[PDB]
């Protein structure tokens, strides 16, 4: 068996069944953030195009899935007991699905002990707290100028479409 | 035979008041709503209700 | 007729801004006038047709006897 | 253990339990659940998610809602107080008459007795209904199926039997009204009360009522089956008791199963079913019988949709049966009441030995004549009072009388019919038809045998029919 | 607020995978970006399968999904009586805001045993054939089966219209709230229909829940449930409500469809299976309740309009197994001109007697039989040509009765009147008449009894039963009056 | 906004516009698709991908290719300049008299007018056919749906109907060729040219053609229905008119929908259908009707798949029908024209009062007579005659005349008939059969009622013989 852990993010199923494993596996031993900032650097040294198709080549033939990161980033110490799960991902073909594991992992990994919202007619109200609407009043203390009518707008809509909606 | 008459005139004015009301509603709203937005204070009112969220959300 | 006072200030005065004019009630609106004329005649067609500002008085009759 | 409802997709409630995952069938108690929403673990879905079944209806379950596992299957009040009481599935009343406080609780699983506990050869339970005993010489403590729709007073019939017998009866009864109209149960309620077969001065009126109606969601309906089951086992085994187990209607249980199969991850089989239909009944059916611990006479009203039977389900049922009633609508339609499908209402336990030859043979002659009669019937449905020979006419006519002799009125639905019914002890019957076989008098009209008591009464009726 | 708000996870086809709202109550009516409601029917862990109530072309994705946080209710009242609304209670009549602005959960469970009571009230339809051959009780759920406009609806109409007088009578035992849940009956259908009820203004105690063909499926699906709470309400408030669900056949169609779009199954005949349950739970909510519940009732007249008499047809089998009969209406007869067109062999009320006046019972009992027997010599030997002379008379009798059980296109009645003509035939004064003229006899006969024997009728009406007065008069009337009718 | 062709699986075009996702129904124009390739958004699939439907060819659609949102749902010119024009679905000619240019464009998906301006009741239109008028008295502005088998003289009939009606018409007419044969449209074209009521001194002809043929991809066929509606609603409501809307054949629409259903990833319901089939019905059908704003007399050719009517599609349809017109292939097979199954064809306004109940009653005797006679047919089928009953023997013969009497050759389709067809006003009709009810002919040659209009002429037809 294992033990379920989730520090905020948190998807459940389809990579989210997966993330919640290394979530208890990295959070046990607490190599979690050491592997976040690992996985973050790897999020782009992977995603590239010197390779569009040489660190994420899946196939032209299988050989990549034999090992290409079981061997090219186990060519990196990066990922040194979480590079086993990338080797699984490399064999198991989900190697293009990593962006949502790492997004789950990092919007996981910050916000991993944090809270994001966005109410009505704000939109960058998107942060990492432990308490709420004391903090988003602190965003109205950026200046209450600039907010709750733009970015995303009480103009047509909240307020403006509601008097149209009564008819 | 008489009444249908009368009733039309009423019904016209009733329908006419609604077709004023719709044309009014669209035009009135389409005139006097465009200019409003010069209130940064409609967002001080966003601010105001938002302090009455940030406060009055307990 | 209804509420919120800053928004409704924009609208409720605009209820009666329309009514606060009556030769073209701040707009009768030419389109309103045109479609009105359409529907008012078309309404008339959809109606019975014996002028609506006239009294239909009586008629008389004589039934079959042998 | 604890779970959160992680997904509710209908009454398959997927609860993901932290770790804390108990066996299948395990009753979970949903917490924060307005009522006792027992979930029966259906699957350990994997990863400590179970697919469970709600037996309640969902209505406002918060996503995540907390479940604290009741950790074993549904244990329910049982014991004698369920007699003279209406219990719901969860062993609680729905008589709405206080609690049905037991001592004994039971997980409403129980199982099939062993081979050694089997009694190998059974003995007739008589009904005093000519047609019934004759064609189905019912067995004490067996599995009786009543295939039957509604209509005929389906329920009426069963009830009527219940009335004649379950009253008369020495032991107890358990009634599980599964997928059954609360309203009829209501009328019935008042009736049982009325009759004192629910005495309200006896919680051992003679009968425990278990109701798991149609307005129940499947989870309730399915499991009401177990409920009734568990209870009767109490009286047989525990209480020794010759229990009668009335089910109306096992089909609807099963159906509840078939209906569910899909959500249940089981393929809609043939006919849509649960492919597990067979065990669903089977293992279950095996839980009810005559052992050497007594008898559970298992009386199953069986909807067979549109009464089709070639549909597997009844096909299976027979296997479990020992007495089958396929009631023939034709017969009903002929106004003939008993409206049985006579040559498809049997109890296998027919013999010149066992049932006496007198009977038996009479039956063999009868079954035969009917078979034959039918043949000539085939001529008549479109070809009437002569396309044909007249010795043959005798037999035909004889059948027309015989038919009328098959008709036994109802001693309860006299209300509609005006017909008092009769209950006709066997000898007078066998002999009766045997007289018809002897072709008694026949200048007569053929209704002379219609809806009377024993054959004499047909005679009685006969003189009277000559004004 | 936008925190128990969600973004539309995916949408198309009105099947909203809904992002967020992760604390959602099961079957929460949700609240839209487009204003709209939806039902969080499906709690998947990673989304909420939200059935979108109404049109979704409006909709686009990531759109904000707001809780309404409410499990559906519908506005409830008697101020639905005299209202055509859609199920949310939206005047489509353009009758403006309903007085029914109390609301009530549309799901409210079906009665208890003790709470229920058996029926013993009659009720009626103004249709001889019906009240006679299917005498009507109160608190029902029993199947009306027949095909479409023929004035399929006529059948219902004459009934509703018939309750008018009863609503002009008193009690919820004469007065009756009629609930017409119209499921998928086009605007036209309705347009017309409503137009009729209104004309009859039998509409006055009557809800017309109007779900026209256009309407979105869940809505239509819902429409009955909506009605259902309202009718139980009436029931529990002593009121005897009558719902004609016309029809669940269509409802299923929607319901499955909805399911399918949710990928939620297509069981037998493509419909997932708890549509029975759907209705069972729905219909059990129609009952005749005990007095603690005001004694009220919700009489359910479900309708299934059959495709080609297809009844072993899943939903029909289902329905049959709930219903306590089915009233089969027979087309051939229709073509024959026999409208009502019945086959009463295939119309059954197990119920029978709880549902009727003595008056009728006395004349009808025999009549049923007389026809039965009549039919039988058409049948054993599947020839309308005879098998015995006796019956050559009896057949005449049957035939006479045949003329009688008909019902005028667009015509109801009341029981004493009904009995009036029926007695005439039953006790025979018009086999000494040619069968076609029997009905003719009625026109006069009826206008006569109405005229004269409203007295007498006063008695029959009083007794709910034909009395010695009435009878004595009748024997005489019928003979004399009949004699007058002829000569 | 622009999309990328992300997947093309035929004309189901999976588009990812990442440039936001405009409505479901937002009409798209494909870039790199010079030939105007409309896709209509169907789903917001998520992923800024929509499933859209090309209605058209999928040539040279590189996966990625830019698709430019048309910024509204599909809009079409509507204007009088359409009449006498064969407009395709896309608002464009196929009159090929240059573009069918109009003042106003309309988004073609639309609302089903509200109940209250809908006139709640209607009046029987006369078709000039005994059989019709008498037996299924269809209503002006109603939706009459012509169930009928494949090419079963239906096509002939409709044309004849056009012939009978459209001429006489006061308002105008629309033909929406839904899955029509290019040929028939041709035929029609010429017929119309010919008729000159598609007068070309009129792009304001008496009839507007909107065609959405078979050769189009379904999306087009699917959509021609909406298109046509949109125009016509405009003429009815907007141009006041009593529109006759000839649709041949909505089935083909339906089919077009159904056809996509699969590869709308949907479960295509029974037999492949649509689960939404019904809503589909509401959504067009409820849009077409008679308001107080005129009448859209809605003539729907309905292919009755495999003449299977129990077939849910038709099963539904009846509900929508003010007039259900069932053509009897069975009868048709008897060579008979009027070939109807009138014991299946109805008008709700077939119900006494409404139509003059005599008129009706005269029918009721017939309807009966034939029906009973129909009943006999199993018996007869084996048994023929000689142990039955006499009265029936009479009816049989009478029915046999009646049967024949409904028959009427084709006036237009003398090319088809050889015959000149006939046309019968009410009286001869009502009387005609009624006369047969009087059995005035029962020594007059029975078949002689065949392919006649007036009973008089039929009487004559018996006579020349004897």
Concise summary:
Chain A is mainly α and 167 residues long. In chain A, 35% of the residues lie in helices and 0% in strands.
Percent strand of chain B = under 5%
Q: Termini distance of chain B?
A: 67 Å
Gyration radius of chain C, in Å: 23 Å
User: CATH top level of chain C?
Assistant: Special
* N-end to C-end Cα span of chain C: 68 Å
Number of helices of chain C: 2
Strand content of chain C: under 5%
CATH architecture of chain C: Helix non-globular
The tally of strands of chain C reads 0
How many separate structural domains of chain C? 1
Counted beta strands of chain B? 0
Shape of chain C: elongated
**What string gives the helices and strands of chain C in order?**
HH
Helix fraction of chain C by DSSP (H/I, runs of at least 4): 40-55%
Subcellular location (chain E): Mitochondrion inner membrane; Cell membrane
Modified residues (Phosphoserine) (chain E): 10, 40, 100, 118
Family (chain E): Belongs to the ATPase alpha/beta chains family.
Organism (chain E): Bos taurus (Bovine)
Protein described:
- The structure is cut from a larger assembly and holds one copy of chain A (about 170 residues), one copy of chain B (about 60 residues), one copy of chain C (about 70 residues), two copies of chain D and one copy of chain E (about 475 residues).
- In chain A, about 35% of the residues lie in helices and about 0% in strands.
- Chain A has six helices and no strands.
- Chain B has helices spanning about 5-30, 40-55.
- The radius of gyration of chain B is 22 Å and the shape is elongated.
- With about 70 residues, chain C is mainly α.
- Chain C has one domain: Methane Monooxygenase Hydroxylase, Chain G, domain 1 (Helix non-globular).
- Helices cover about 50% and strands about 0% of the residues of chain C.
- Chain C has two helices and no strands.
- Chain C has helices spanning about 5-20, 30-45.
- The longest helix of chain C has 17 residues, at about 30-45.
- The radius of gyration of chain C is 23 Å and the shape is elongated.
- Chain D is built from 13 helices and 17 strands.
- In chain D, the strands form three sheets. In chain D, strands 8, 10, 11, 12, 13, 14, 15, 16 and 17 form a nine-stranded mixed beta sheet that branches.
- The interface between D and E is large, with 65 and 65 residues.
- Chain D: Its EC number is 7.1.2.2.
- Chain D: It catalyses: ATP + H2O + 4 H(+)(in) = ADP + phosphate + 5 H(+)(out).
